[PDB]
Design a protein around this ligand. Structure first.
Ligand SMILES: NS(=O)(=O)c1ccc(Nc2nc(OCC3CCCCC3)c3nc[nH]c3n2)cc1
Ligand SMILES: [Mg+2]
Lengths: 269, 255
């Protein structure tokens, strides 16, 4: 089963399981392996694994991480993914003193919205957009990862799980416990990440739910990013609109004048 | 994304479609046994207050599993139990725990059997669980009401559920078509309106193109009291669904 894979190093722990860097001994391919324990006497295959796998098998896009294989054993499930060289959070930290060039920020946002628009047009909400879950390679690409908190949504949506999105990236409609939420929640997260790429610090780093809400109302007003030009500010304000319906969709965001001159720069690693 | 999503589900319903003739290739089980199973699942869905979507998913999984795996009749309920458990994990905010599924089989099966079947079903379906359902198309169609009528919505939902019971004829029809026939019949029964213009534009389905499925579902509605399986009728008598099953079907459609 796993005979052909040599573990190189442990990468981290996401919503569930553990991710390792591994190499295929026969092809030379370097992969990320997600190891998933199965509760064989109690609860079985976790719902997070069921959702991530079923949905990732549908979502084939350049800006969504590729699931290559699922390896079954009696007691473990291993997901074989393409390996990306590092996460956006690590990149930003390494760039804390020198900053990230605007052409790169713009390219990254463009690609993320492409991946997100693909998700949303395929009735999938990600629900965990944070720089830790966004992976970059040495050739200018960025991709959506860790679909452990994702789900398939209905048209129209019904009430879904409230315990969703890390605090810092959580949209006002979640923080106020609105009955319904949808695709707008992911755009909010992306709006926060856009701001964080430009400053290299989190936009709304709340210490609690109330602190989170106050930080949002402080910055936006009751229902920002100096290095950013007029085109950038306009897009950012549309991604951080208070009203979920008024908040821009990923599709419409791609047609924004901010992206008129977007290229694909290679990052500095 | 309402149009993008609709298009995608129309594509997916073809890929996720079970084998039409499969029960003929099953040596130990029949359509009558599948009816018994699907009815019991309706009961399960009621005891645990599951989403209607969950029940529709569970049925898709069972039909697809039985399309490729021969199953003896003593193990048929085991397949169904595992399918409902998988659908619950996929769709529910708070799915019942495994022990609750073992309890409802009245201790015919062990918890180890249920969990081992869960894994077998995942393997056979190759984890492809995000299937389009009648319920999914219906929720979309309800948006084309003017005005919204929860008697109509509940009765379409009722008729859509009746189709799950009978593999013959309903295996040969797509979720989108069944949802089309159910919505027209519910709309007509309650108000007297027909399949809306805006829904033809959306779906490409006309009342003539929905006709064969409409004829079957019309008959299914008229003879529903005499069906061996009565759980869906009993469910839809409750004020939760506004007692839509207590209504009299139209004698005709004038199609
Ligand atoms: N920290 S880091 O900068 O040293 C570094 C980061 C991530 C990776 N690579 C990588 N990681 C994944 O998820 C692991 C990660 C995601 C969720 C949070 C915990 C763990 C993948 N999933 C498919 N392919 C993947 N590739 C390499 C180096
Ligand atoms: Mg047979």
């Amino acid at each position: 089963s796993m005979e052909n894979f040599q573990k190189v190093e442990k990468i981290g722990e996401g919503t569930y399981g553990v991710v390792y860097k591994a190499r295929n001994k026969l092809t030379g391919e370097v992969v990320a392996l997600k190891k998933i324990r199965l509760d064989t006497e109690t609860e079985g295959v976790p719902s997070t694994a069921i959702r991530e796998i079923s949905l990732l098998k549908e979502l084939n896009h350049p800006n969504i991480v590729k699931l290559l294989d699922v390896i079954h054993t009696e007691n473990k499930l291993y997901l074989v993914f393409e390996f990306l060289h590092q996460d956006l959070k690590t990149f930003m930290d390494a760039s804390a003193l020198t900053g990230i060039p605007l052409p790169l920020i713009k390219s990254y946002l463009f690609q993320l919205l492409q991946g997100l628009a693909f998700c949303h047009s395929h009735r999938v909400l990600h629900r965990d957009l944070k720089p830790q879950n966004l992976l970059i390679n040495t050739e200018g690409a960025i991709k959506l990862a860790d679909f452990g908190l994702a789900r398939a949504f209905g048209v129209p949506v019904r009430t879904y799980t409230h315990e969703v999105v890390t605090l810092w990236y959580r949209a006002p409609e979640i923080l106020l416990g609105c009955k319904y939420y949808s695709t707008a929640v992911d755009i909010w997260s992306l709006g926060c990440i856009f701001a964080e790429m430009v400053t290299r610090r989190a936009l709304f780093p709340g210490d609690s739910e109330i602190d989170q809400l106050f930080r949002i109302f402080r910055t936006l007003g009751t229902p920002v990013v100096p290095p950013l030009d007029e085109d950038g500010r306009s897009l950012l304000s549309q991604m951080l609109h208070y009203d979920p319906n008024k908040r821009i969709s990923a599709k419409a965001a791609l047609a924004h004048p901010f992206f008129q001159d977007v290229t694909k720069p290679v990052p500095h690693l | 994304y309402h149009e993008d999503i609709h298009t995608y589900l129309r594509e997916m319903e073809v890929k996720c479609k079970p084998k039409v003739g499969y029960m003929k290739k099953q040596p130990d089980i029949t359509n009558s046994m599948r009816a018994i199973l699907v009815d019991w699942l309706v009961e399960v869905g009621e005891e645990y207050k599951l989403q209607n979507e969950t029940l529709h998913l569970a049925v898709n999984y069972i039909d697809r599993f039985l399309s490729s795996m021969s199953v003896l009749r003593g193990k048929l309920q085991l397949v169904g139990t595992a399918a409902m458990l998988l659908a619950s994990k996929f769709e529910e905010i708070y799915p019942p725990e495994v022990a609750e599924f073992v309890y409802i089989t009245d201790d015919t099966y062990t918890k180890k059997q249920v969990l081992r079947m869960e894994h077998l079903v995942l393997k056979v379906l190759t984890f492809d669980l995000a299937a389009p359902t009648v319920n999914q198309f219906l929720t979309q169609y309800f948006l084309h009401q003017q005005p919204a009528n929860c008697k109509v919505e509940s009765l379409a939902m009722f008729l859509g559920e009746l189709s799950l019971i009978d593999a013959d004829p309903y295996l040969k029809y797509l979720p989108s078509v069944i949802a089309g026939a159910a919505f027209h019949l519910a709309l007509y029964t309650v108000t007297g309106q027909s399949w809306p213009e805006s829904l033809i534009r959306k779906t490409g389905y006309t009342l003539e193109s929905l006709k064969p499925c409409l004829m079957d579902l019309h008959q299914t509605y008229l003879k529903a009291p005499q069906h061996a399986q009565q759980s869906i009728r009993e469910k839809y008598k409750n004020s939760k669904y506004h007692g839509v099953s207590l209504l009299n079907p139209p004698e005709t459609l004038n199609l």
